[PDB]
Design a protein around this nucleic acid. Sequence first.
DNA 1: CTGGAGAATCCCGGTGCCGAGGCCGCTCAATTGGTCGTAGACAGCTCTAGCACCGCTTAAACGCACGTACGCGCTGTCCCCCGCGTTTTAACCGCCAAGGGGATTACTCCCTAGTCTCCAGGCACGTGTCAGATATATACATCCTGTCTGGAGAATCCCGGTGCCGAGGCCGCTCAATTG
DNA 2: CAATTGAGCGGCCTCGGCACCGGGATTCTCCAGACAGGATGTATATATCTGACACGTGCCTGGAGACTAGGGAGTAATCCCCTTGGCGGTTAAAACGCGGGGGACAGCGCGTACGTGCGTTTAAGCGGTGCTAGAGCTGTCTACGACCAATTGAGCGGCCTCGGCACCGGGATTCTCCAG
Lengths: 71, 71, 71, 71, 71, 71, 71, 71, 71, 71, 71, 71
Amino acid sequence: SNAMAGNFANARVEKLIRQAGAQRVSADAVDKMNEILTDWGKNIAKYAVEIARHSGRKTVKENDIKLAAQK
Amino acid sequence: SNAMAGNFANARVEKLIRQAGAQRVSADAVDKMNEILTDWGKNIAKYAVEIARHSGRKTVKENDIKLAAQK
Amino acid sequence: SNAMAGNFANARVEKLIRQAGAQRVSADAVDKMNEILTDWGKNIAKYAVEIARHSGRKTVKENDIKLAAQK
Amino acid sequence: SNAMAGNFANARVEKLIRQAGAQRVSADAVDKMNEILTDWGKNIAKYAVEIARHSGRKTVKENDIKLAAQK
Amino acid sequence: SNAMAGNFANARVEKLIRQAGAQRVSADAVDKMNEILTDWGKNIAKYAVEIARHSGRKTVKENDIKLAAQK
Amino acid sequence: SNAMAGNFANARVEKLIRQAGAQRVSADAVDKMNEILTDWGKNIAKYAVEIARHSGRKTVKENDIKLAAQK
Amino acid sequence: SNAMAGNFANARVEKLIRQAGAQRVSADAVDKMNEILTDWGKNIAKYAVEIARHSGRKTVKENDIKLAAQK
Amino acid sequence: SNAMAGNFANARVEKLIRQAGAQRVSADAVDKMNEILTDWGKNIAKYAVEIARHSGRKTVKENDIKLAAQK
Amino acid sequence: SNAMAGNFANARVEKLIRQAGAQRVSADAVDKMNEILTDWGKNIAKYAVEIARHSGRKTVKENDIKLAAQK
Amino acid sequence: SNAMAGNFANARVEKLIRQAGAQRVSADAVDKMNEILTDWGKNIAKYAVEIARHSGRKTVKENDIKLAAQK
Amino acid sequence: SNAMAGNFANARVEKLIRQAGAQRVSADAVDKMNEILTDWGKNIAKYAVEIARHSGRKTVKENDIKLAAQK
Amino acid sequence: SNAMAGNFANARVEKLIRQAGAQRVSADAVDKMNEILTDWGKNIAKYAVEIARHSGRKTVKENDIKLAAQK
DNA sequence: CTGGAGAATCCCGGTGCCGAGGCCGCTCAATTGGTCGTAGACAGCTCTAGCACCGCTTAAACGCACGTACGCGCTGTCCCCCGCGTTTTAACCGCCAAGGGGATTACTCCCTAGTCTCCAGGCACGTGTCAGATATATACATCCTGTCTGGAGAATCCCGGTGCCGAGGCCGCTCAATTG
DNA sequence: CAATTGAGCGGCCTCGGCACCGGGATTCTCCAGACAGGATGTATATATCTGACACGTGCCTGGAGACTAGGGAGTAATCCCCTTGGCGGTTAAAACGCGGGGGACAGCGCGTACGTGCGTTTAAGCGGTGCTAGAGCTGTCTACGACCAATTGAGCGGCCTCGGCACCGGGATTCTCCAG
């Protein structure tokens, strides 16, 4: 569902909320968490791609992701 | 791989980095991004579960996720 | 002085710094500590008010302050 | 009340919670907020006193409070 | 009052300003806030309708509002 | 519905989207627009309350809302 | 020079400034204009890619560029 | 193609849209983006030339481009 | 009234609306016209001051106002 | 001076240019700004009078000025 | 150099970049940092001047700068 | 004064606030603005130094400052 | 077309800023001498644009069903009117503290020579990519009931005056601590 | 070491923080009722892993470019010392926001019905890959044009001072705009 807004599988975002200690989880909470992870992940990935390319490279590497998350 | 450290499918974290504009993506960058999403998602989910339970409820809902992300 | 920036009495912020072990205390240090306590207290109080209201209540209670400080 | 645990006047901690937007405030919430401000203020003041004395001075100044809060 | 300029109920725009922390609220401030919300909401809604129709649809959906607000 | 997340009446947010030119409007789009108006209105109202109080006043006035929207 | 900051050829950005009526053009003005075109073009292209993908397509088309420029 | 309407090389406008994240790019989208960059660049360059000449100079400099873009 | 929002005398803004052909003029229309003239005049004056200073001068002159209005 | 060309008091148009940041202001710049405000204000007022009369009214109101400025 | 674009002394902007940990610093990086500080400082100062004047004062004070930076 | 907290000359921070339009400027406002510029400049410079070193270089360059400010 | 009432009008008073004059000096313009950095002309390596070929991605076509619009239901709300007091604004004194001034300094900006180091080119290894199969964990019903939401009523305890001490803030004198 | 700066100790008197009663509305508790999350079971479209390919990265090498260090002259930042403009208390009295009470209107909801958006396939666009040729963008070197820096003169903007023009403000009146 809403594949542009939530990138990840719903069954995996639900597993994450239930391992955080949830006794029950609403389907709307799984969709909201999926959207919040996707928006935040997209911000880090966009900045890591600019760091890769400033470095002089086509390939995104572990160090570019690590530096972009620290911003 | 490393299912406690990276919760999401690697093929979906790779798709996110390539839609951010990546020309090529290292497997270590996919693993690092998966770990960074998992650690941040776990922090929000743990706090949303405490908001649900303070409210008086067993169920995590959309509003608890929304309030926990705003913290 | 500066009642929007420093909420607390200066004589009480000075007593706190002198019980921390200060041999002498500058008036600018009392004003800076008052401002730092006020800015941090305002952040916790604003979030505790959103927790009260999510809970369904007009009244801020001890548990809302306790949960907001743990954020 | 509890002058070692809450350093500030209760009427001033209550004013802070009501300017954060509180419609009503419990006396236990005023006491809990006073305790949380006091414990956090004491940690900063104790470290600022060690910075003053490392610097070679008896007087706590604005810059020592500012550096201790940034820790 | 002024139903083209302020779309929302005045009692609901006043409630929003008082939950933001207002001790008292002028009727002109309620009218100005209503106008500012209406002008900004109309800009987002007009652009979301063009996104719906570019997509090939008569119906405005959640994703069109979300994409129009991000512009 | 979701009265903390959407402050305004749904029938009034729907009227706004249909006067922007919408042929049809999804209930999720009405809820998303209500949330986006509420989050943006809350940011302006919180800053207008700080301008009122810096000015030396308990009352939020038209000029404080106007200055806060221009920020 | 500075291929991440200025995307276009300098000889083509210089031709544009001289057809605007310039009698002489500084090399720093050619570099500044190249950077300003690149930053603005990147903003439009990033938003057109999100419109393409909301539409359900991998391909950026003329209508997505046209709608993104009108934002 | 259409050298008065699109000033820049098509291969460079295509590279810009693909680094914005495009999976595929239509030739009409490359032509439309080239035209939109050219029309906007011409407006800034024409105004920067009037600023140069008001200043008393034949040469367009970095500061004239910077001031014209801020208009 | 509202001297920051309306800069000009109300009796002079009213004379302007009545010479435009108005049979009667509301006091709120005089206040709205005063605000609209003030906001637009402030935008031109701020840009004319930057043109004066780019030119190398402390004095705003007729040519700086004329160039700023043409922007 | 030139009361048909500049409607406003010169002392008030000068105050506006000096609050925009002017260190010094030429009398010709005050006259040019007065003329530019008068010509633009007359265009809005003439159109607001036609909106009032289309509406069926002799009185120019706040909403007619607001709609005429948005044209 | 470029005194409208970079307000501060270059020797002081260079000292700041070298205390941030720089082993070597390019003269173009000192000029770019000076410009970025100047543009951001000008935005805060312009808004603090509007807060001073809304308050009813000719003098910019510490509290106006503090409130303008928090915007 | 306070050379660790305010890096820039006070006469240059005062000139910036007076060109923003200030009729008068308090010495405490000059000190507060100097501190706010220094804290923000230090954050950008520290991150630009990490970008330089990730790139493989000892020298901070214009592009590293530009990328660090965009974070 | 008709009734009822906000509110723009026309009048009169008085006072506050607009406008005009005269005087003083900072500021903008012109003029000159050297220099930075532009325009012109020339060689060659580069990346642009243009066929030709292959297939991924697209735009229609149409057939189930998700979820919208129209209609009609109650009652939960907002908007309006009145009475009451608090908050704000305007007018007046008195003291910080910004302003404008002159003098001496520190630290800035520019020119220098010496060389560390960032860029460019040509190389060999690492590894991300593209295509193919396997099987697993995802998403979508379906049936059940656990949980959350309401609704109504005790009663807890926070809001709202109250009087009165407590202690926070201010001023002045002093010499200990900090700065240079 | 020397000589300020400004924090400490002191004495008076205000603001405002505290503790005490009363009134009451917000909160919690106890059932009833219906969403909607959970658990089971299926079909399948994903994610994962392989293996063969070659493009991209990292290495080592050389050359020039631009940063570092060192010196000098000039300057603008800083620091008193003085003047006074203006920020801030004090206050007295309208302005208008709060609070309580009524009443219709419009927002929410529940059902019904069919419109339309999503899904599955089809055929043909047309974008991607690949190679070739060449007209561009680039970099150099040359030299002179025009920009910047320093100066001098005068013009016009800034400051102050008058006085009177007109903007602002009631107050009584009736037009006219809003409702129905």
